[PDB]
Structure 1
Amino acid sequence: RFLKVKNWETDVVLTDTLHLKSTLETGCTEHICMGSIMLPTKDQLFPLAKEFLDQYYSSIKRFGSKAHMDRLEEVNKEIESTSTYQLKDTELIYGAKHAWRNASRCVGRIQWSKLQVFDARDCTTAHGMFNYICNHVKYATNKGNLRSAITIFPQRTDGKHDFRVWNSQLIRYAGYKQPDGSTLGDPANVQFTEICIQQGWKAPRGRFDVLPLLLQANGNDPELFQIPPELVLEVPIRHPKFDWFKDLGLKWYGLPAVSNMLLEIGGLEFSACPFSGWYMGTEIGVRDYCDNSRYNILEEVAKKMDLDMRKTSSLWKDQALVEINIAVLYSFQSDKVTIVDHHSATESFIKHMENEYRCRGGCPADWVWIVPPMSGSITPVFHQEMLNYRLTPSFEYQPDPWNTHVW
């Protein structure tokens, strides 16, 4: 019930008590651990509202005060009457910051309290959503000096009037299936690219085409918009040693901005809540570039380096991997676009864990996601035991809306 986590590199032991507030379920049982599985009414709503308002009022040292009680009373009256309620601005901001704070898969949470929250609950149309999103993108990008932000569209009502951003991120590259069987551009987005084409998009059919936004207001059929090219900051990828690297013609965008997730605050559901931070280098240079089902560039790079590609034991893949990641970091740094490397990010997260243990009694963390996809054991997170559990407010996966939308 009071659980210990040990760092095996430093012997530091931390005691977790926060897990006892865990509300949602993990997918694991005493018989089976699902740690590596990617996805494991009025009556319902009032406990959720209360649980949230209690933690909110406690956070501002006003637990058990009239202002606390009064707000419980008010929301209670409002649910009874309307079957939902509206968060105060102060609650919305707190809820959103805490959804990031509770995100067990996020290595970047030392930053959780510096989050700019844009309240878009007055939005009514896809054009309005487009406006709010462009403003988000420009604010967060800040000419390369990136700032964390989330834009929150109106909450779910009857569930037939959902706001959704159909894109998985605000900024991603198209993927095209070709005659010759191969894939041009990002194969992860092939399907979404086709949904764009079939909804009208005129695609340039290149390797790095910024996708248009496909926005759904109020349960209506979604609409297409091109983000002003001028608001999409990109980095050409070169290497500080290898002159030929630039010839590969690689680039990536500066703003990572997840747009397909659902924010839950005090029982309320915000199905459109695009949020953004900045990149850790490996996301681009290890996953985006080197996954076999992504840009899959290792072969071409290793070839340019003239490595012995005959045998897996020459570690040519590993060699090329490092260099590609050196180039990503170098290019963002040279163009002055905020980026963090995995050494620096994981060291920060260990510091954050210690802060959260001291100040909050724990920190939910998902080791499988927190350890970088390269050089795992040479980052301190590898040696750090983590307890994973679900706290609310939260971000949650939600199914892609084309599998749901009634047209």
Structure 2
Amino acid sequence: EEKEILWNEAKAFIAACYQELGKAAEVKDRLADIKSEIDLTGSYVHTKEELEHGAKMAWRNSNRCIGRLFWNSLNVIDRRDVRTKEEVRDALFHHIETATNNGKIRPTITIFPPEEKGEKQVEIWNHQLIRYAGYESDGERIGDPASCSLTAACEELGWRGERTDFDLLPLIFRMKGDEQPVWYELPRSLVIEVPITHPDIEAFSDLELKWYGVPIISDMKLEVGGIHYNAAPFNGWYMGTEIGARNLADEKRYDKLKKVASVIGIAADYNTDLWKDQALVELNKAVLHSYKKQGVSIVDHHTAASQFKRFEEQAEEAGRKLTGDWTWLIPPISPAATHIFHRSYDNSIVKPNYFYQDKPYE
């Protein structure tokens, strides 16, 4: 009965994948092999080529992602061979190093062994491989509030954060058969961070803001042809607004706009002064300037949207339907200055794709 769902997903993915790779004549034989393998084993194993193209298709199909123009150049690392926690750890360290690439970020995914009977082989607890801790007790808020529950779970396991506003969380994951996850402190030499300064307001450095170089999302499930790769961290480079208009700006995150207004020398008293808007613009200029000055890849929302327009044009030319989530594609500052705001998108879900999955803590 589950062999049923699997086989159907397999037929659809292999046909599509092989068409795209110019291997259409190999489909019959490959599906025959797949069919025996499911019958006998309950599952099937992707070839390296299928897995690579599958991860790339999954990015291409991610409705909420504005960065999809570059789907075909995703660097896919096949780590289906790992069996021990040390191998998982070192694969994760390697992903950070190779993705970071001295600042010239390479969009990369590392793919771990997939679920078997819906049994995870490896279960990653981090939201991103590099992320700051958050604390709150006695009204006192420190660090990143979005990290509060994982931070508390880490401190249940014997880790202790220094309680700066920018503590790096350890890697934390659980192996099949183990009751508890293990954790490993990140080697600081692997983690690039960028201090936030402003191109012409010298006092901006008084805020002592920084952010990390590479967002490596590690809690989503990659699904390809019926196979569920629950552990498959991936990364791009940041779009500036993610950091300047959300991470550093949201009231439920670092909540810095009032402090930004003060250092740029404007009053934060009247809604009609649009001081939040002005502060947002200067904070976002600072983030882009700072990443560029440090030689870490980043894209601004205008350039990103113009890349996405090319992705739309490419989809049409290739004869593929385009799907998108308008509510996530529009950037959180000046959305009406992008073409995205002025058209609509079909939010249908197409596989292969990346999906949310339940948190193992909380």
Once the two structures are superposed, what CA deviation does each residue of 1:346-386 show, in whole Å capped at 9, x if it has no partner? Answer: 01101111111121332111110000001110112111221
* Contact 2:204-2:264 at 8 Å conserved across structures: no
Matched, 1:279 2:207: no
Q: Secondary structure at the match of 2:98?
A: helix
Which residue is 1:357 aligned to?
A: 316
Task: Give the alignment partner of residue 308 of structure 1, picking from 267, 289, 303.
Answer: 267
Task: Give the alignment partner of residue 140 of structure 2, picking from 168, 174, 182.
Answer: 182
Task: Report percent identity of matched pairs.
Answer: 42
Once the two structures are superposed, what CA deviation does each residue of 1:2-24 show, in whole Å capped at 9, x if it has no partner? Answer: xxxxxxxxxxxxxxxxxxxxxxx
Q: How far does residue 168 in structure 1 lie from its aligned partner after superposition?
A: 0.4
Q: How far does residue 306 in structure 1 lie from its aligned partner after superposition?
A: 3.1
Structure 1 residues 214 and 398, CA, compared in 2 at 3 Å: closer, same or farther? same
Task: Give the alignment partner of residue 72 of structure 2, picking from 113, 122, 146.
Answer: 113
Which residue is 1:53 aligned to?
A: 14
Kindly report which structure 2 residues correspond to 1:44-193, keeping only aligned pairs within 5 A, or say none: 44-63=5-24, 65=25, 67-179=26-138, 181-193=139-151
Q: Secondary structure at the match of 1:360?
A: coil
* Contact 1:282-1:325 at 8 Å conserved across structures: yes
Matched, 1:215 2:176: no
Which residue is 1:295 aligned to?
A: 254
Which letter maps to 2:284? N
- Greater alpha carbon shift after TM alignment, 332-341 vs 118-127: 118-127
* Contact 2:218-2:232 at 8 Å conserved across structures: yes
* Contact 1:169-1:256 at 8 Å conserved across structures: yes
Matched, 1:337 2:296: yes
Which letter maps to 2:328? W
Once the two structures are superposed, what CA deviation does each residue of 1:149-192 show, in whole Å capped at 9, x if it has no partner? Answer: 0000001012334422100001000001132x031000100110
Unpaired runs of at least 5, structure 2:
none
Matched, 1:378 2:308: no
Q: Distance in 2 between matches of 1:76 and 1:264?
A: 19
Q: Distance in 2 between matches of 1:320 and 1:298?
A: 6
Which structure carries more relative contact order (alpha carbon 8 Å, separation 6+)?
Answer: 1
Q: Distance in 2 between matches of 1:291 and 1:333?
A: 23
* Contact 1:239-1:245 at 8 Å conserved across structures: yes
Q: Distance in 2 between matches of 1:159 and 1:361?
A: 32
Q: Secondary structure at the match of 2:38?
A: helix
Unpaired runs of at least 5, structure 1:
1-40
Once the two structures are superposed, what CA deviation does each residue of 1:253-284 show, in whole Å capped at 9, x if it has no partner? Answer: 01011000000000000010000010000000
Q: Secondary structure at the match of 1:227?
A: coil
TM-score calculated relative to the size of structure 2: 0.97
Which letter maps to 1:186? D
Q: Distance in 1 between matches of 2:319 and 2:185?
A: 43
Q: Distance in 2 between matches of 1:357 and 1:183?
A: 48
Q: How far does residue 219 in structure 1 lie from its aligned partner after superposition?
A: 4.9
Q: Distance in 2 between matches of 1:112 and 1:329?
A: 23
Structure 1 residues 360 and 125, CA, compared in 2 at 3 Å: closer, same or farther? farther
Aligned residues: 360
* Contact 1:353-1:362 at 8 Å conserved across structures: no
Q: Secondary structure at the match of 1:290?
A: coil
Q: Distance in 1 between matches of 2:333 and 2:129?
A: 26
Once the two structures are superposed, what CA deviation does each residue of 1:172-231 show, in whole Å capped at 9, x if it has no partner? Answer: 00001132x031000100110011111111211111011100012225221101121100
TM-score calculated relative to the size of structure 1: 0.87
Q: Distance in 2 between matches of 1:329 and 1:60?
A: 37
- Greater alpha carbon shift after TM alignment, 82-91 vs 119-128: 119-128
Which residue is 2:277 aligned to?
A: 318
Q: Secondary structure at the match of 1:113?
A: helix
Kindly report which structure 2 residues correspond to 1:7-22, keeping only aligned pairs within 5 A, or say none: none
Q: How far does residue 61 in structure 1 lie from its aligned partner after superposition?
A: 2.5
* Contact 1:178-1:184 at 8 Å conserved across structures: no
Which stretches of structure 1, 4 residues or longer, exceed 3 Å deviation after superposition?
Answer: none
Q: How far does residue 402 in structure 1 lie from its aligned partner after superposition?
A: 2.0
Q: How far does residue 304 in structure 1 lie from its aligned partner after superposition?
A: 2.2
Q: Secondary structure at the match of 1:296?
A: coil
Which residue is 1:389 aligned to?
A: 348
RMSD value, Cα: 1.1
